[PDB]
Amino acid sequence: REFGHLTRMRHVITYSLSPFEQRAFPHYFTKGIPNVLRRTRACILRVAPPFVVFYLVYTWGTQEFEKSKRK
Amino acid sequence: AGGVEHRQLLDLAQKHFSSLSGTYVEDAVPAFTPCRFTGSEIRHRDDAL
Secondary structure (H helix, E strand, O other): OOHHHHOOOEEEEEEOOHHHHOOOOOOOOOHHHHHHHHHHHHHHOOOOHHHHHHHHHHHHHHOOOOOOOOO | OOOOOOOHHHHHHHHHHOOOOOOOOOOOOOOOOOOOOOOEEEEEEEOOO
């Protein structure tokens, strides 16, 4: 797998600019937080509700162990 | 260039190239809008050539 042996492609053009013709940070916090808020609204409905099921077992699991030693 | 007289070429220029106006229309003379260089790249990929 070397570079001129990977695939076969036709009719595609690429334009690129030098690293010395570009400023370092084009859009940092005017575009940064509406892009992160898009990726947070997507994958927090798959990640977070499994971890609140651990929480309700933890808070119930140390409210039975502390009534297991008293009256 | 070649076998030519400069004198003869001048009168031929005088009788034929005289109706050309010498100044411009409204005299809004042109100015050079210069051109700058830019490091960059363009790639056209075509494996059938």
